[PDB]
Structure formats: structure tokens, C-alpha cells
Amino acid sequence: GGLVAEAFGFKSDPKKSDVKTYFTTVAAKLEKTKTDLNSLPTAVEGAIKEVSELLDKLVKAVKTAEGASSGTAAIGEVVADADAAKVADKASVKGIAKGIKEIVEAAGGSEKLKAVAAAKGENNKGAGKLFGKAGAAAHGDSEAASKAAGAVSAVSGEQILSAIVTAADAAEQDGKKPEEAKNPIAAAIGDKDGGAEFGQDEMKKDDQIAAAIALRGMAKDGKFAVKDGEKEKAEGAIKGAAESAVRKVLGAITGLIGDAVSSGLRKVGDS
To answer: How is the protein disposed in the membrane (predicted)?
Structure first.
């Protein structure tokens, strides 16, 4: 099912509900692998217990994410009507993040290209305008949507994953306008007063912006707002970003999990 796996994942117009499906499907594969492992029969038995516990931690971790993936709208939902705009559901945002943190820790955490590269450059801070209100006094527009896509293009999936993991550990995880948010979780949930560019130094950076974007796109009630007469002009760009942001994060989770399991199964393979 290599082509079926690609048809899904790179599908057109992916939904926030596809995110839930992704985790459930992952849980399923993890559960089956755990059954096949515990159905083989000293040191070997010890390697089976450890790998089994690992599998358990992952399933519980993805299920936290799964239960948090309660959205139904497009991952790249774009609103131009002042009434359509909303604050992202905080329980979905924080839960998705915590699930991701649990997944990453269960398999490790600080790993791979977790950084070791210039992460500075407030070039895309303008992506914050998409996190505010819509319609009349809205700032969201064509150029800001390009900023959001640029921020996402400038970072790998691992980096966006790491930014979410760190965010989940922050203490100020409640929604805040673009000008005040200090972590991607607070930026993704958002505030009712809306706002323009990301003003804090903690944000502004590409991996943080890309994280705010991916979390918002995956969470329930998370939508992107633009000024009227801008939807058709900026829709495509923000939609592409949210979708790429999510595809990058989930693909990295897939790679991380895939390796955690392999090295575990290889471990028992030795002894």
C-alpha cells in the first residue's frame, strides 16, 4: 500500500478529521505490532518486555493526540467574514501538543536536527496577521499568507516537531494575540482582539511560526483570517502552508516512531 499511503497524506484538501484518522491508524499498527511481538514464545524475554513497554507508551501517547484531534474543518480553513473568525479550541490545541510531546519522549525527544542551524530571522513575523480577526479591521492578506508559507518552507518537519514539543512544556499555554504570544501553543489558540505581526522575540522565528501554523491547522476551530477582498487572493497560500506544516509534522512523527520501533525490534533481534 505504498501508493495508497501516498494518496493519503498528499491528498488534496486534507481535513482536520484526517489528522484523527492518521493517529488512529498509527495506534492500530502499534497495537498489532505489540501483539505479534508478545506472540513469539531470558535476556531475549527481557528485550521483549522493554520493546513491549515502548510500544505501550507510544499507543497511549498517540491516543492522547488522537483524542485531541477533534476538528472537522479543513486543515487550511480560511475565513474572510468577521463572524467566521474564532479562537482555536484550547483543549484541542494543548492536547494535540501534549500528545506529540508524549510521542516524542516515548521514543526519545532531543534528537536529530533538533537545531544546530540559524533559527533566527523575523522575515515571516507577518504570518501573525492570519491569527487575528477577519473582515473589516483585519490585517490578514496576500502578503501575510506568503509569509506563513515561507516560514513553513524554511524549516524541516523535525524542527517544527521540536518547536511543538518545547511549547507543550511552556507554562503560559493560553491563547494570546499575535503581538503577545511567546510560544506556538499560545499563538495557535489565539485571542479575540486579534492582531498583526508576531511581536515577541520568542515567536517571529520560522520554526515557531511554522509550529503555530501546524497546530492551528490540526486543531478544532482553528482557522485563518484575511481582510475582505483578500480570501481569493490569499486563500491558496495560507492553505498550502497549513497543509505543508501538518504534512511535515506528521511525516516526522512517522519517521520518529518508525525508527523507535525498528531499533527496538532490532534490539531483540540481537539477543
So the answer is: Lipid-anchor
**Boundaries of domain holding 56:** 1-271
Residue pair 50/264 in contact by the 8 Å Cβ criterion: yes
C-alpha cell of 145?
A: 499568507
CA atoms within 13 A on the CB side of 121: 12
Q: Rounded to whole angstroms, how far apart are CA atoms 166 and 270?
A: 34
Backbone breaks in the chain (C–N > 2.5 Å) follow which residues? 41
- CA distance linking residue 170 with residue 153, whole number of Å: 25
Percent helix, strand and coil across the chain, each to the nearest 5: 60, 0, 35
Q: Are the C-beta atoms of 197 and 179 separated by less than 8 Å?
A: yes
How many other β-carbons are positioned within 10 Å of the β-carbon of residue 24? 15
Q: What are phi and psi of 257, to 5 degrees?
A: -60, -45
The coordinates were experimentally obtained by X-ray
For 134: left if phi > 0, alpha if psi spans -120 to 50, otherwise beta; the answer is: beta
Residue holding cell 515577541? 200
- Counting every residue written for the chain, the total comes to 271
Reported resolution, Å: 2.3
Domain count, the chain: 1
Quick one: which of 268, 253, 267 has its CA closest to 105? Answer: 253
